[PDB]
């Protein structure tokens, strides 16, 4: 386990820098101020995800249309996954670490106005704690999330996409092989980690539904039409590791 594989070290090196929400924690929370900070933090993280993708081996070789499609389909999962990692890493998964300046502990969640959403997102960090996910496993898993959903008709650079996905799958195995020595144990951990990824498909639509309803509550038939493919099943093709 000593030496970390080059590709994994590369992934760590391209991890975006800390992103701040720009939230003023010296003032009492309000439903509006917290929603405002999340949207601001969200846009910043999105641009960060796009930048990150540009340094990911194999990504820029895909048709630009596939690149756009993949980011569109996975930004929510990537963000909730990163949130889970920060929460697990910095606060033992005991609270939601959206940013250094936006951390919601249990009490803060209960009074945020979106407590149910908090409990759902909290599921990821809690699972990270149980599994004790390593930084190496995390980095490989995150790339797989970016490559976990495609159009029903597939992509333009389909073969290239599949080889890119297959490579990071192999890399996840190396990551696991670092602490898991044994063919039965390493195999079992692969199932656990990838099963966790399969389970995110359902969770992600929950987040998109909450996003839409938060929008509706601020203000249509057209906006709702463009969001359904993100909350409804059968509109895209999730790539499951297990039946």
């Amino acid at each position: 386990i000593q030496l970390i594989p080059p590709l994994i070290n590369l992934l760590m090196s391209i991890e975006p820098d800390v992103i701040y929400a720009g939230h003023d924690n010296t003032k009492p929370d309000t439903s509006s101020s917290l929603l405002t900070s999340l949207n601001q933090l969200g846009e910043r993280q999105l641009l960060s995800v796009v930048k990150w993708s540009k340094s990911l081996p194999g990504f820029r070789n895909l048709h630009i249309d596939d690149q756009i499609t993949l980011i569109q389909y996975s930004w929510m999962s990537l963000m909730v996954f990163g949130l889970g990692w920060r929460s697990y890493k910095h606060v033992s998964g005991q609270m939601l670490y959206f940013a250094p300046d936006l951390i919601l502990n249990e009490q803060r969640m209960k009074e945020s106005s979106f407590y149910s959403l908090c409990l759902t997102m909290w599921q990821i960090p809690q699972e990270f704690v149980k599994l004790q996910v390593s930084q190496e496993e995390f980095l490989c898993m995150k790339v797989l999330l970016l490559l976990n959903t495609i159009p029903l008709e597939g992509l333009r650079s389909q073969t290239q996409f599949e080889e890119m996905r297959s490579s990071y799958i192999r890399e996840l195995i190396k990551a696991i092989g670092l602490r898991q020595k044994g063919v039965v144990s390493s195999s079992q951990r692969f199932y656990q980690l990838t099963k966790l990824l399969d389970n995110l498909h359902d969770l992600v639509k929950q987040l998109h539904l909450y996003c839409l309803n938060t929008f509706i509550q601020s203000r249509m038939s057209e906006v709702i039409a463009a969001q359904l493919p993100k909350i409804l099943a059968g509109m895209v093709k999730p790539l499951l590791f297990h039946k």
Binding site: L46, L47, K54, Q67, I71, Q72
Partner: peptide, 13 residues
């Protein structure tokens, strides 16, 4: 609405 943001961000740098 993000497609526009994503598309523009991908071309840039």
């Amino acid at each position: 609405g993000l497609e526009a943001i994503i598309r523009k961000a991908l071309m840039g740098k």
